[PDB]
Amino acid sequence: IQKTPQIQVYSRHPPENGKPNILNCYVTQFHPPHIEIQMLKNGKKIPKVEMSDMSFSKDWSFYILAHTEFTPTETDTYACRVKHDSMAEPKTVYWDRDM
């Protein structure tokens, strides 16, 4: 049947407040390919998000990478929100600084 996405949210480099960085949302192991991915800053969709082409895995699933430039601060929250038919509602995964 439908396969549920695995979602990994991570920065390129160890985060330092006030230093520009790249935030990534890597979504894997989903089927069918229809999916909606948003990267969020304080709950608001980030307008400048780059999406890789979607690829297919030999384990019978699709994967894709969203990323954006960001500057971490003490108070800003970042997340990736993923809507897929395998799930009853969109899943929000927070960037975890305790990472």
Structure token digits, residue 83: 């809507």
Q: What is the resolution of this structure in A?
A: 1.9
List Cβ neighbours of 32 (8 Å cut-off, separation of 6 or more): 2, 62, 85
Would you put residue 18 in left (φ > 0), alpha (ψ -120 to 50) or beta? Answer: left
Question: CA 16 → CA 20, 66, 89, distances in Å?
Answer: 8, 21, 33
What CA–CA distance (Å, rounded) separates 81 from 79? 7
Q: What CA dihedral angle connects 32, 52, 96 and 91, to 10 degrees?
A: -30
Closest alpha carbon to 69 in 46, 96, 93, 94: 46
Whether 24 and 10 have beta carbons less than 8 Å apart is answered as yes
3-state secondary structure labels for all residues of 14-50: CCCCCCCEEEEEEEEEEECCCCEEEEEECCEECCCCE
H helices, E strands: number in the chain: 0, 9
Q: How far is CA 54 from the centre of its chain?
A: 13
Closest alpha carbon to 26 in 57, 71, 2: 57
What CA–CA distance (Å, rounded) separates 70 from 30? 27
Please state whether the peptide bond connecting residue 15 to the residue before it is cis, i.e. omega within 30 degrees of 0: no
Whether 21 and 10 have beta carbons less than 8 Å apart is answered as no
Domains plus CATH for the chain?
1-98 (2.60.40.10)
